[PDB]
Amino acid sequence: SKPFTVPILTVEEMSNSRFPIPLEKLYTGPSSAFVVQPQNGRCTTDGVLLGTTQLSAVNICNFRGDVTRVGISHDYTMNLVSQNWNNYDPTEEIPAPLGTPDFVGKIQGLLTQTTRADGSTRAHKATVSTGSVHFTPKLGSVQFTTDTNNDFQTGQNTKFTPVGVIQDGDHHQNEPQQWVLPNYSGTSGHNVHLAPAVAPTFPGEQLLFFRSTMPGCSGYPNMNLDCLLPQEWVSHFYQEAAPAQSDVALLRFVNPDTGRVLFECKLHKSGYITVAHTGPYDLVIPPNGYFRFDSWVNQFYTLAPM
């Protein structure tokens, strides 16, 4: 049956699967203090999409719909539609629309709008607070704070394009909280249909993360953003749909110039990586290095230490 592979793209050639920005580096660290349960960048090695994961990075943390002003304030409610402007279905068995933010934080960008009848357009700086009780994407609406109280029109197609994150408070880097899921239905109900939490189980192991730095837009935010799989790996597995022959795919990270293996890791078939290391470590890698699938192993495979 179809041989399994991972892409040959280098880390810096790839994209974060949790926000529309490039990858910067590989990082491993302790996760015992967190529940690591992201909903974007979740895909099995056989190509089954999980959580809120969809196929292109450009759609992540984007929103579309019509807007109405909240009272006489600068806030606007967006009634969500799908990526292609068709109705959103809240009864679909997913946690929230595909691409919905999967962390608690205040994401800043531009809210843009076109008036269909005459082609007039407009844009305003806007922020969505995903920890707000008004963040209810599973129910079909989210709220934005904007720089206007009267320029947006009702009944017109409106898009939010994300740019970065903000923070407010004396406790610097206290938000965003990248490992805290929002309440997709607000106070109305609990989250449903989630991709599972992941954790290392084998002695001496940690998760391996693909790390980016989100742009900061105001205050003193925590800009670190870790994903479990690059977006290009999600797309690759989805298209290849190569069957998993065991629970774990052993990958070697290779320098293509010398041919030498730098380290090895375990790609679990449910779509995340562990390495043999303890503590925070920014991996020291050559920029042309890439991952290579070598063989099908089990969960108890003892890796060469990082």
Ligand X SMILES: C[C@@H]1O[C@@H](O[C@@H]2[C@@H](O)[C@@H](O)O[C@H](CO)[C@H]2O[C@@H]2O[C@H](CO)[C@H](O)[C@H](O)[C@H]2O)[C@@H](O)[C@H](O)[C@@H]1O
Q: Footprint of a second copy on this chain (CB under 8 A)?
A: 7-9, 12-16, 20-22, 24, 54-59, 83-84, 108-110, 112-114, 118-123, 125, 159, 161, 163-164, 166-167, 172-173, 215-221, 223, 232, 235, 239
Residue 215, interface with ligand X (CB under 6 A)? no
Pick the closer one to ligand X by CB: 156 or 177. Answer: 156
What minimum distance in Å lies between the beta carbon of 71 and ligand X? 20
- For residue 216, the partner it binds in a second copy, ligand X, none, with Cβ less than 5 to 8 A by kind, is a second copy
**DSSP per-residue codes, 122-135:** EEEEEEEETTSTT-
State in angstroms the smallest separation of the CB of 110 from ligand X: 12
Which of 122, 125, 134, 193 binds ligand X (CB under 6 A)? It is 122
Q: How far is CA 190 from CA 2, 95, 224, in A?
A: 40, 10, 27
Number of other CB atoms surrounding residue 193 within 10 Å: 15
- The binder of 145, among ligand X, a second copy, none, by C-beta within 5 to 8 A per type, is none
Residue 17 CA to residue 284 CA, distance in Å, equals 22
Cα–Cα distances in Å, from 12 out to 69, 210, 213, 246, 300? 41, 10, 13, 29, 31
Residue 68, interface with ligand X (CB under 6 A)? no
Rg of the chain over CA atoms, in angstroms? 20
Judged by beta carbon distances under 5 to 8 A according to partner kind, the member of ligand X, a second copy, none in contact with residue 151 is ligand X
Kind plus residue range of the DSSP H or E element containing 224: strand 224-227
Compute how many other C-beta atoms are within 10 angstroms of the C-beta atom of residue 283.
19
36/229 with CB nearer a second copy: 229
Question: Does the protein bind ligand X through residue 173 (CB under 6 A)?
Answer: no
CA angle 293, 53, 92 (to 5 degrees): 135
Residue 259 CB, nearest distance to a second copy (Å)? 18
Which residues of the shown chain bind ligand X in the complex (CB under 6 A)? 120-122, 151, 218-219
